[model samples]
Target: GMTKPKEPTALDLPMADPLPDETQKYFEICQEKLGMVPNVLKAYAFNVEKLNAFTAMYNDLMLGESQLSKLEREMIAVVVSSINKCFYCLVAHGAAVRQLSGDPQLGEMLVMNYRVAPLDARQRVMLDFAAKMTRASAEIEEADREVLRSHGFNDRDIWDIANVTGFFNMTNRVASATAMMPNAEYHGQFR
Candidate 1:
């Protein structure tokens, strides 16, 4: 129902041509490594400054050092996107979960509902906290954090989870509101 099928979003903001040298290198790196630049990055390519900030924060949260492994971060991403029902995120992060965990079933489970997945106590509470936070951050109380602490997550780990969950909550809204589309390549990757 749109003219340019490859447009990242419904709006007409085109990806800036002659991208900044660093930004071009970054996209090249993504292409070289991930096979294609994620549409989410291209979505922000309309504003290189905004793209840099979004990509930086995303890398810091999802790829930076943390108690959460890469797989765990992607799990958090899928679960949050599931709760939000963000189509673009569900597709992209769902693949991440599938590829990183090497279990397509886990990806499907998280994309549908993390609760349906038979997670251990730690992973369970982690997803539980993310769900509750996604639904109602105000409702979260000391007991919730305490439960996570008992599962061996320190306060920093809790913060990391909170940030990641909050981050997805934000992007989910942006992607949905703007009708962002995941790259077509995500459809057939990492079966």
Candidate 2:
């Protein structure tokens, strides 16, 4: 006898199975490359078509032609996740930042206070821009591009950074809204 569950959707829909064949192939590739599928990826797979689209965009933004290093991208993720208080994203991407930069302290500092993170002038400028994008997009103006340009980022590079940050902000909100939990494996990974 099953009473109406508080959360109507069964966990099995997202968490209990592989995605469709095409998506599963890529997902297994991610597991082979990174040791596990991120929980966000798994949850997103509940809608396989959307998940594939997201994966395509995410790969292009994170792994495509971009000026920012993997570490910097992950740093932006941690910063945005911290602002949104998305525990899962912060924990998961914090691990990625650690792996990329080989600096555990940097992740902690970025999450706690990006102002205190050890960053060069250029990175500082990028982080500041990401912060603005995360907190106040409507206020963004042409002057913002000027600031990034002064720091050696071209227009396209700035677009890349903004795209990544903006995407993650969207992801963070969704995860936070759902009270998404961080996978336990995220803790020990990259250690």
Candidate 3:
């Protein structure tokens, strides 16, 4: 007879603790920054050290100087989130994409299919690189580097694009695998 596995509950998962000093401090910071602790971070509190490290790396990569415009960064995030089928990140980052691009329809376009987004040639090239990087990085070659170079993307910007996409690939997997839920506020904002 096959042994039955126990059914899982929220408690059965590695939920973050509210009482830990480090977690509490981190939660406080999030509250101050976003006026609420995003559920993703709250859930990650289950592993405070990992949560801190993840956030630190995220800040360093996304918020740091890079040739990618803010909208382009959000565009890559949306593309990767969509490919990962992570509803949480898709909704959350989709809002960011719309807000940053100042085009309410941009979110729908990117979420449904980035090909429809009203991007200039340079943006399209960047998205092409990001999509390939997200979907099939192993197949990329020097030709990929040359494409970016032709579009005025220096090596640093290309590196930033790859770094952002790679980091979010891991992030999207975590959010999707955990079934992270997005806040309701994310639904219509910037739409």
Top candidate when judged by TM-score against the true structure: 1
Tens digits of lDDT, candidate 1, 55-169: 8999999999999999998999989999899999999999998899899989999998678898899998999999999999999999999999999999999999999999999
lDDT of 2 by residue, 1-191 (tens): 36543221225454345456877787889899888777777777777777878888888888887778877788888888888888778888888887888878887888788898668888998888888988898999999989999989998888888998998998888777775667677787666
**TM-score pick, better of 1 and 3:** 1
TM-score of 2: 0.87
Best by lDDT: 1
lDDT of model number 3:
0.80
Q: Which lDDT values do the candidates have, in the order given?
A: 0.91, 0.80, 0.80
Worst 10 residues of 1 by lDDT: 1-10
lDDT of 3 by residue, 75-148 (tens): 88888888888787898889888888788788888888899877888888888888998889999999998999
lDDT of 3 at 155: 93
What's each prediction's clash count?
0, 0, 2
Off by over 4 Å in 3: 1-11, 14-18
**Candidate 2 local accuracy as lDDT?**
0.80
